[PDB]
Amino acid sequence: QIVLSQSPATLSASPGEKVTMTCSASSSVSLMHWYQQKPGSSPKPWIYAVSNLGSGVPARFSGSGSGTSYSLTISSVEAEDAAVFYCQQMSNFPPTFGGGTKLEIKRADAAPTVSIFPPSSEQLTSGGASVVCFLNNFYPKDINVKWKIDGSERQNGVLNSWTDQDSKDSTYSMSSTLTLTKDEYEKHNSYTCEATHKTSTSPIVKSFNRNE
């Protein structure tokens, strides 16, 4: 089958800047289709038959190419363009897709809004104790999170999860969960979620004390 190779894997641009992404085919194709996909939804038709914009697609998007190489350009990128773009051909059977190019929209650096939550009384009732930390709406995506118990770092039993870039405000968010047993949780008193982000030379912390 025809292999479609997309480049680059990630584009990152400030609003108003121009970006071009390319789709290279292992054999010559007559046309290239493009789709835009955002987390939690199906790929949306974006460009059909190389250069025709789909319904609702703004005029700042354009498509061009021929033979084994095609491209998608955004003349002035906007916050809403934070998505993964896929190319697809149907000139040779079977129809095939490229691996996608993700577009990250730059914004002014923003500090994570940190929140910490002790185990619920419901979970403690079943012998478990998860301590949750949310580090919300920050930019850039790079962040480090540490867990501290009674003033010392705790490692092992930590599960982290990150969201994709927000389409409205171009920020990222992260969740961190430290899972202990109820017995181990109740042997300590101070619990801290510590973030290190480039928007502050000092760590951003949120704590709770079991005495409270």
Partner 1 sequence: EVHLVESGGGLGKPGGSLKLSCAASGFTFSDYYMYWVRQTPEKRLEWVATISDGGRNTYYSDSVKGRFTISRDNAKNNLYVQMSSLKSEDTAMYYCARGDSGYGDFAYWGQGTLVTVSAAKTTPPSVYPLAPMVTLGCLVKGYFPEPVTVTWNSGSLSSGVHTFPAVLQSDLYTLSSSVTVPSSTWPSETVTCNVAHPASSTKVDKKIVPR
* Site residues for Zn ion per CB under 5 A: 187
| Contact partner, 187, from Zn ion, partner 1, none, Cβ < 5-8 Å per class | Zn ion
CA 13 to centroid of chain Cα atoms: 15
| Residue 183 binds partner 1, judged by CB under 8 A | no
| Residue 91 binds partner 1, judged by CB under 8 A | yes
The torsion angles phi and psi of 184, rounded to 5 degrees, stand at -70, -40
Residue (17 or 31) nearer to partner 1, CB: 31
Q: Which residue has the tokens 């897709």?
A: 97
- 3-class state of residue 101 by DSSP: strand
CA–CA dist 21, 9 (Å, integer): 9
CB 134, min distance to partner 1, A: 5
- The residue with its CB nearest to Zn ion is 187
Of 112-151, binders to partner 1 (CB under 8 A) are: 113, 115, 117, 119-123, 126, 130, 132, 134, 136
Quick one: which of 144, 162, 200, 209 contacts partner 1 (CB under 8 A)?
162
CA–CA dist 98, 1 (Å, integer): 12
Name 107's Cβ contacts closer than 8 Å, sequence gap at least 6. Answer: 14, 15, 79, 139, 169, 170, 171
Is 108 buried (19+), middle (13-18) or exposed (0-12) by CB count in 10 A?
exposed
Of 18-37, binders to partner 1 (CB under 8 A) are: 31, 33, 35
Contact assessment for residue 113 and residue 177, using Cβ atoms and an 8 Å cutoff: no
| Residue 110 binds partner 1, judged by CB under 8 A | no
| Residue 9 binds partner 1, judged by CB under 8 A | no
Q: Determine the Cα angle at 99 with ends 95 and 102, to 5°.
A: 130
| Residue 86 binds partner 1, judged by CB under 8 A | yes
Residue (169 or 184) nearer to Zn ion, CB: 184
| Residue 175 binds partner 1, judged by CB under 8 A | yes
Which spans of this chain sit near partner 1 (rule: CB under 8 A)? 31, 33, 35, 41-45, 48-49, 84, 86, 88-91, 93-97, 99-100, 113, 115, 117, 119-123, 126, 130, 132, 134, 136, 159-163, 173-175, 177
